[PDB]
Amino acid sequence: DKKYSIGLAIGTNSVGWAVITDEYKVPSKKFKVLGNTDRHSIKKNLIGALLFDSGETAEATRLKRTARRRYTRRKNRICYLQEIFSNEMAKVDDSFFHRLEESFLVEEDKKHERHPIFGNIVDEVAYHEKYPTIYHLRKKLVDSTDKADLRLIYLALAHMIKFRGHFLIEGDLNPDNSDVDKLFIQLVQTYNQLFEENPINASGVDAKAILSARLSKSRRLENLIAQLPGEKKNGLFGNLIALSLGLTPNFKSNFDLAEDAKLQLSKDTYDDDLDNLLAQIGDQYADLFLAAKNLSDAILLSDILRVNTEITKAPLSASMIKRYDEHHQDLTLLKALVRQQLPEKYKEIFFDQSKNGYAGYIDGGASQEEFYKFIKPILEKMDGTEELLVKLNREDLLRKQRTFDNGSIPHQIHLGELHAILRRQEDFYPFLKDNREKIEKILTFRIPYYVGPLARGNSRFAWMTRKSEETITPWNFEEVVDKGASAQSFIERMTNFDKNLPNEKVLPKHSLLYEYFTVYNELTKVKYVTEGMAFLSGEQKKAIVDLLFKTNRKVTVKQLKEDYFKKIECFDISGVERFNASLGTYHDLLKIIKDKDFLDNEENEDILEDIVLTLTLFEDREMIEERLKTYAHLFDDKVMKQLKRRRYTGWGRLSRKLINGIRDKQSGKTILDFLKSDGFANRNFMQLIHDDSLTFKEDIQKAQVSDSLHEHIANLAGSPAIKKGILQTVKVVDELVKVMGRHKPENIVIEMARGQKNSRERMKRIEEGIKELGSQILKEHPVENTQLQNEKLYLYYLQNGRDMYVDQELDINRLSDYDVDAIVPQSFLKDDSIDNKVLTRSDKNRGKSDNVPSEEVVKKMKNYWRQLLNAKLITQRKFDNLTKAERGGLSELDKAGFIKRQLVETRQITKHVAQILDSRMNTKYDENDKLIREVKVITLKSKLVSDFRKDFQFYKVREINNYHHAHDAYLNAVVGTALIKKYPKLESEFVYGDYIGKATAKYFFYSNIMNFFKTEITLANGEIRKRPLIETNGETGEIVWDKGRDFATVRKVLSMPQVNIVKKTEVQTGGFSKESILPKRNSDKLIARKKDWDPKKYGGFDSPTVAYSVLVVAKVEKSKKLKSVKELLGITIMERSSFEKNPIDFLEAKGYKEVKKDLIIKLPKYSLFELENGRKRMLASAGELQKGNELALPSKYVNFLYLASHGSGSGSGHYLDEIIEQISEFSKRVILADANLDKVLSAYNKHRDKPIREQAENIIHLFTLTNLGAPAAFKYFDTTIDRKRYTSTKEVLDATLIHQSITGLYETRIDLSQLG
RNA sequence: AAAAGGGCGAUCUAAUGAAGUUUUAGAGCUAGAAAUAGCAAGUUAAAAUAAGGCUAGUCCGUUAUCAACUUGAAAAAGUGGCACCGAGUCGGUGCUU
DNA sequence: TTGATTCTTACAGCGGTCGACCATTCATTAGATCGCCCTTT
DNA sequence: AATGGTCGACCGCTGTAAGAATCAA
């Protein structure tokens, strides 16, 4: 028995745990070791860290589900088309679909003829010669009227249905609107027709290039408006161009309107909104919008269809045929130019599949960018290729028909081509003329997002309510699926429930009841003190609501005191400084319906609540129209349209029963009525909730009947990695309490922690910002990926190559002389993100180190900052922090706040994990039903321990080992315990419990909190070493800190060579193998793609994921003699379920015999094996091992490396040699690799002339060979050394397998040598 | 003090588009016994896209969870003595069952 | 002497380490939750 | 990106069977 505390450091991949006593010492105990070896007890130091792989998210699984459902629904649409064409195709070919389905099978396995389309070689070659691509057949079936073969018609319709197109456009993209210049001219003409006085016209503009550019839509709008001098952005023509581009302009100032008239062509309500505009402006303007609409139809198709739609009714097919013909002609010309000028490279461009070129781009499957980059120098070093470079610069040299650009193809063009083919070929076939709507619906149908999967109770993701338990088809969807109820289930499935009434839903934030509740709760507290004479009469509040809250939207206090406190009651008040509780939806519905008596009717309030809930639920217009038809008879048709135009979003916090349905028995009144009137004492909502006399609190506690630990962890808001770390943390705490014999700690001080993907995201952001900024910086200075990791160059390309503190330009390759400056002082806020860093020539450009850059900088750079913000190059937070100088800058309050943020946590995830720890530890209540808090759950911040290390020479290098996690946990425990002992008045900011305005006081208090740990003070007179050696607590005889003994204990603890580093063994869960489908080969490693497909004939997968390995000792045959061998086999995820419940069967199926079913051992990943000489290996897979030994470098060398990497140490030179010797000894002891060690030694002896700083910085990197885990690569002065992978597991078969507990204190060893 | 409005971030769900890959179809010509050499043409299409599963749906199948043993049916639970000297991954020495 | 036997001993087959090479992507739409940093009212 | 599957080349091990004795009868 003792009084101990626990220290925890929570991370996304690690959980450090440590145990301290009242003397800040770490106890050591002997633990029993089970198994077969003679070791029955091992001593350990009760401090360590649990390592674990990061927890991944469900985003990948969701993507897989969506892809699988998309594929299956496409296959089902094809099957619907086949079911339609079956009976008619039987009269033409009985084996047509049979040959189409068997196209994948080889002729050896093909039951019918090879050619699927027809069944003969002659007509097959004839069709492929006459129609080379399928777009030829598309255009032939669209344009020509001759009766074609039913097989070709089915092929065209199937290619249209299989790849329909994006449903991002609502309505009908009219193909007749194809040219941008003609439609822009028509828009200018109809604009001039409207106003003859000031006709805005410009013939020198070219809309086809300005409006159809690759820039941002707003940038194209700006470029077009800049070309016309008479027009402006706020003008009506600017809004017309915005509508043509789809920027959702507003026509308030253009038509002298008093309301907002926002029109968006992509939205569904547009027409209605348009009509509303046509109800306020003259109808003669309507044609203008029509023209604008036409422009919006031609500005998109300009990229989709490149041919005149009047030439043929298949514009996309014609564009594809033009692609094919241009490809053919350019390929012929290129072959001629190669055979005429440089034939020596012909075999390299038209015959090699490995290298790039026409043979690698077609047959080798190379990229189009690689193709262009490979041909660019060849076209530059030629004569008759000066014109082909014009097409290669626009990425249109040798274009295929199925490229990525085809993503921009909407389903409307394919629907039009299908309708054309159907109308042409229906005059010959009866079923085609009779079943046109069927195929049109097959290609048009799209399951709504608010319906989900079409399941009958076998899908945990589905929510659709069926009107009839029948098979759902694209034709009877609206009759089998209740779309309204499905959408309501979709929305209510994801909304929150009332925190006080868990079995009740929450009304929307725009509910009239919620607004009444807020107004009444806000109005209950009012001074209203006249001369001489807070009563808050219920009738008076009702009169105020009827006269002010129901007449004006925002009730301001100056108008309040003059309307009721002066006019109603004659007088000549300080409750609330506006009220922040307006009846906004009340006035909205009033302006919509123009009937105050209907709103003030108590009987009609239920209908109003249902209307508001319906407006909040659905977003689609058809849903709200179907759900508002029940109230159609109540209002006028115009009022009905205006109410269907209104749309609300957002949800409140309280249920409907908590606002008005609840009523105390003894009080005999509802809670809303209590807020309206409560006698002389007008109580509040919180007063009504937490009152010992109110029956409310008891019923609220009774309604909360209920769960598990994992369920509570999953409900927490945060990344899954943090939640996994938290779960491992509570497991570690449970096991630690178990080690202490079910004794609870006195304190638990817990502290949490705050790439090609990042490079790609940075490249995307820079490209988008420069495109919307219209700068040529990406063209002048070519930027490549993975180079933006450098902060200087990243900030250069983010600031368009110019300073943000002055108007000068920045020079490439001079960035080392330029400096990065923090927008807020690093002394105040310790933020090193891009939202706080600015690349400038000199720091003196900033106004002062005290505060934000002065307003003299803002008044000059605000325009540039706004241009950067509008280009999405800087966050709005950075704009605010830069321009804060105009708003007074930083005062003394926000400085104290920034200083306190660095010490106090104020993080909700930390609060929740502290609540979890407190609810798990403190579970006893006393006589007065008060919680007995035995364990203080202290929440500490990383900055505190980091400053402690930096101030007291307790440096730690992360690259050395994993001990730093345990050490940080120990330091957190020590610092938290000492802080609570020194300053108990601060327990409200650390210990989890119920617990200019002296701004400089708080600023200075939170600045030197830890100065009582120091051993000296620096007064203006000098360095006075008169610091109390025994720091104690005021009015408490307890000693808090001892400078003579406690530091020694901390140094000894950090110098301990035994730390419990444990790697969590986990079964690999995920995909079956690599997703790539490799071609066929003569190897058993190819996994079959289908049960009826052969890998050597069709290819398949290559690298399966090994999980749940099995050590087995059995006899195998090899004159077919049986030899008894022991080996571990790697089960794959695909065959994991089959291996379960069938050990002997699955093992004999692979070739094993006489398998000892009782000796089969299950081994996950990272399983620990001690071999010899203290070497430990972790089973990485079936045939790979990982370093499992931790190097314990002495703290002297750690501090030396830290001080020499920074340079201020000037430490001993031979320390480098001593560290090299220790690394070499550790390597020779546990690292089986010796060639890498010899290479390291040679490189070190070669680079001895380098300074001590660089030598230490590279010795830090050298520790990779001695780190725990998978071997990796490392560089020592540009001398990279490859990893040495342990490609065998034969030694592990006789090793000592160690099953370690969560903390590693309870071990079980098994000698595997006694199994063969 | 509070609301509101933005702006970034962590997640979760549903509906879609385009590519990618694989097998097959798209007859390759000439010379030559052959090995192979010389030419021509190449852009497209079908089918699959986790093996598959029963619960038979136009459903589900890559998230979370996992040291050992003993139970339970799963979840989950239970199972391992304490001080003192030291410290290279923990070793001893005392007590106590 | 002669087949069999008994080593026996040098030559082809086996199943271990170095050294690369590779690893399914882009893009929309519609919602719902929590969490933090700001300004504005 | 990471770290494990996979193929190619190499390569020491190894066990194996074809001489080389080696008895015995």
How far apart are alpha carbons A86 and A111 in whole angstroms? 20
Burial class (CB in 10 A: 0-12, 13-18, 19+), A314: buried
Contacts 24+ apart (CB under 8 A), A182-186: A183/A291, A183/A294, A183/A295, A183/A298, A184/A211, A184/A295, A186/A291, A186/A294
Domain end position, chosen among A338, A372, A403:
A403
Give me the CA A1086–C1' D9 separation in Å, rounded: 22
In the beta sheet, which residues pair with residue A199?
none
Are A520 and A676 spatial neighbours (Cβ–Cβ below 8 Å)? yes
Domain end position, chosen among A1058, A1090, A1110:
A1058
Give me the CA A1074–C1' C22 separation in Å, rounded: 10
- Domain membership of residue A1065 (yes or no) is no
Q: Which among A206, A207, A219 is positioned nearest to A774, based on CA atoms?
A: A219
- Domain containing residue A265: 180-304
Phi, psi angles (nearest 5°) of residue A677: -155, 135
Residues 510-529 of A with CB under 7 A from strand B: none
Does any strand B atom come closer than 7 Å to the Cβ of A503?
no
Residues 580-619 of A with CB under 7 A from strand C: 580, 616, 619
Q: Which among A401, A222, A384, A405 is positioned nearest to A302, based on CA atoms?
A: A405
Please give the C-alpha separations between residue A347 and each of A78, A339, A361, A364, A638, in angstroms, as whole numbers.
Answer: 42, 11, 14, 15, 74
Same domain, A510 and A589: yes
Q: Which among A1183, A1119, A1110 is positioned nearest to A1150, based on CA atoms?
A: A1110
Give me the CA A413–C1' D11 separation in Å, rounded: 65
Nucleotide with the nearest C1' to A1232 CA: C17
DSSP sequence for A129-150: HH-SSHHHHHHHHHH--SPPPH
Residues 699-738 of A with CB under 7 A from strand C: 716-717
Give me the CA A455–C1' B55 separation in Å, rounded: 11
Sign of CA dihedral A439, A440, A441, A444: positive
How far apart are alpha carbons A531 and A543 in whole angstroms? 22
Nucleotide with the nearest C1' to A1138 CA: B51
Does any strand C atom come closer than 7 Å to the Cβ of A496?
yes
Q: Who's near A104: CB < 8 A, 6+ residues apart?
A: A1098
Bases along strand B below 7 A from a protein CB: 1-4, 6-27, 40-53, 55-68, 75-76, 79-93
In the beta sheet, which residues pair with residue A48?
A17, A1060
Nucleotide with the nearest C1' to A1197 CA: B88
Same domain, A691 and A549: yes
Give the position of tokens 């990791």.
Answer: A789
Closest residue to C15 (CA to C1') is A1288
Are A665 and A695 spatial neighbours (Cβ–Cβ below 8 Å)? yes
- Domain membership of residue A664 (yes or no) is yes
Q: Who's near A424: CB < 8 A, 6+ residues apart?
A: A141, A142, A144, A145
Closest residue to B17 (CA to C1') is A166
Which amino acid appears at position A1069 of this protein? T
Please give the C-alpha separations between residue A364 and each of A35, A324, A335, A587, in angstroms, as whole numbers.
Answer: 58, 20, 19, 67
How far apart are alpha carbons A1289 and A45 in whole angstroms? 31
Return the CATH number at A731.
Answer: 3.30.420.10
Does any strand C atom come closer than 7 Å to the Cβ of A884?
yes
Give me the CA A1119–C1' C2 separation in Å, rounded: 29
Nucleotide with the nearest C1' to A407 CA: B18
Give me the CA A277–C1' B26 separation in Å, rounded: 58
Which amino acid appears at position A1050 of this protein? V
The 8-class DSSP code of residue A1132 comes to B
Domain end position, chosen among A385, A403, A421:
A403
Same domain, A739 and A696: no
Same domain, A340 and A448: no
The 8-class DSSP code of residue A603 comes to T
How far apart are alpha carbons A969 and A19 in whole angstroms? 9
How far apart are alpha carbons A130 and A1278 in whole angstroms? 61
Residues 301-330 of A with CB under 7 A from strand B: 323-324, 327-328
Are A782 and A797 spatial neighbours (Cβ–Cβ below 8 Å)? no
Are A584 and A514 spatial neighbours (Cβ–Cβ below 8 Å)? no
Query: Taking chain A, what is the end-to-end CA distance rounded to the nearest angstrom?
Result: 46
Q: Where are the beta strands (DSSP E) in A1017-1165?
A: 1017-1019, 1022-1024, 1030-1033, 1036-1042, 1060-1063, 1087-1088, 1100-1101, 1109-1117, 1122-1129, 1161-1163
Q: Who's near A1298: CB < 8 A, 6+ residues apart?
A: A1168, A1169, A1170, A1176, A1307, A1308, A1309, A1310
- Domain membership of residue A788 (yes or no) is yes
Give me the CA A854–C1' C39 separation in Å, rounded: 19
Give me the CA A1–C1' B97 separation in Å, rounded: 19
Residues 823-862 of A with CB under 7 A from strand B: 835
Which amino acid appears at position A881 of this protein? N
How far apart are alpha carbons A729 and A751 in whole angstroms? 11
Which amino acid appears at position A240 of this protein? L
Give me the CA A1081–C1' B58 separation in Å, rounded: 36
Nucleotide with the nearest C1' to A1086 CA: D6
Does any strand B atom come closer than 7 Å to the Cβ of A365?
yes
Give me the CA A876–C1' C37 separation in Å, rounded: 10
Which amino acid appears at position A416 of this protein? G
Give me the CA A148–C1' B54 separation in Å, rounded: 44
Same domain, A1039 and A956: yes
Residues 821-880 of A with CB under 7 A from strand C: 824, 829, 877, 880
Give me the CA A34–C1' B69 separation in Å, rounded: 10
Same domain, A549 and A633: yes
Same domain, A687 and A539: yes
DSSP sequence for A394-409: TT-SS--SSSGGGGG-
Does any strand B atom come closer than 7 Å to the Cβ of A128?
yes
Same domain, A379 and A440: no
- Domain membership of residue A1140 (yes or no) is no
Are A825 and A846 spatial neighbours (Cβ–Cβ below 8 Å)? no
Please give the C-alpha separations between residue A741 and each of A16, A73, A737, in angstroms, as whole numbers.
Answer: 21, 59, 7
Are A472 and A439 spatial neighbours (Cβ–Cβ below 8 Å)? no
Q: Which among A725, A657, A328 is positioned nearest to A517, based on CA atoms?
A: A657
Sign of CA dihedral A673, A676, A680, A686: positive
Same domain, A502 and A643: yes
The 8-class DSSP code of residue A1270 comes to S
How far apart are alpha carbons A184 and A327 in whole angstroms? 32
- Domain membership of residue A570 (yes or no) is yes
- DSSP 3-state assignment of A219? helix
- DSSP 3-state assignment of A821? strand
Nucleotide with the nearest C1' to A1097 CA: B23
Residues 48-107 of A with CB under 7 A from strand C: 63, 67
Give me the CA A722–C1' C34 separation in Å, rounded: 14
Same domain, A558 and A698: yes
Are A50 and A1268 spatial neighbours (Cβ–Cβ below 8 Å)? no
Degrees, nearest 5: CA angle A90-A93-A96: 105
Does any strand B atom come closer than 7 Å to the Cβ of A494?
yes
Tokens coding A161: 């249905």
Question: Quick one: CA torsion of A97, A98, A103, A107, rounded to 10 degrees?
Answer: -150
Domain count, chain A: 8
How far apart are alpha carbons A1088 and A1071 in whole angstroms? 15
How far apart are alpha carbons A371 and A363 in whole angstroms? 13
Number of neighbours of residue A692 by Cβ within 10 angstroms: 6
Residues 665-724 of A with CB under 7 A from strand B: 708-710, 714, 717-721, 723-724
Bases along strand D below 7 A from a protein CB: 1-7
- Domain membership of residue A1120 (yes or no) is no
Number of neighbours of residue A1161 by Cβ within 10 angstroms: 15
The protein residues having a beta carbon less than 7 Å from any atom of strand D are A 755-757, 786, 1081, 1083, 1085-1086, 1102-1106, 1130, 1180-1184, 1186, 1269-1270, 1272-1273, 1283
Residues 1096-1115 of A with CB under 7 A from strand B: 1097-1099
Length of chain A: 1316
DSSP sequence for A544-592: HIIIIITT-SS--HHHHHHHIIIIIS-----S----S---HHHHHHHHH
Nucleotide with the nearest C1' to A450 CA: B14
Nucleotide with the nearest C1' to A1103 CA: D5
- Domain membership of residue A229 (yes or no) is yes
Give me the CA A323–C1' B43 separation in Å, rounded: 9
How far apart are alpha carbons A1218 and A629 in whole angstroms? 86
Closest residue to D3 (CA to C1') is A1270
Tokens coding A1059: 């730390």
Q: Who's near A986: CB < 8 A, 6+ residues apart?
A: A979, A980
Same domain, A433 and A378: no
Closest residue to B55 (CA to C1') is A458
How far apart are alpha carbons A1059 and A46 in whole angstroms? 8
The 8-class DSSP code of residue A990 comes to T
- Domain membership of residue A848 (yes or no) is yes
Same domain, A49 and A14: yes
Strands A1185-1187 and A47-51: unpaired
Buried b (16+ CB within 10 A) or exposed e, A1057-1083: eebbbbbbbeebeeeebeeeebeeeee
Tokens coding A1178: 């972790």
**Resolution for the entry shown, Å:** 3.6
Are A922 and A916 spatial neighbours (Cβ–Cβ below 8 Å)? no
Nucleotide with the nearest C1' to A1107 CA: D4
How far apart are alpha carbons A938 and A142 in whole angstroms? 75
Residues 1219-1238 of A with CB under 7 A from strand C: 1233, 1235
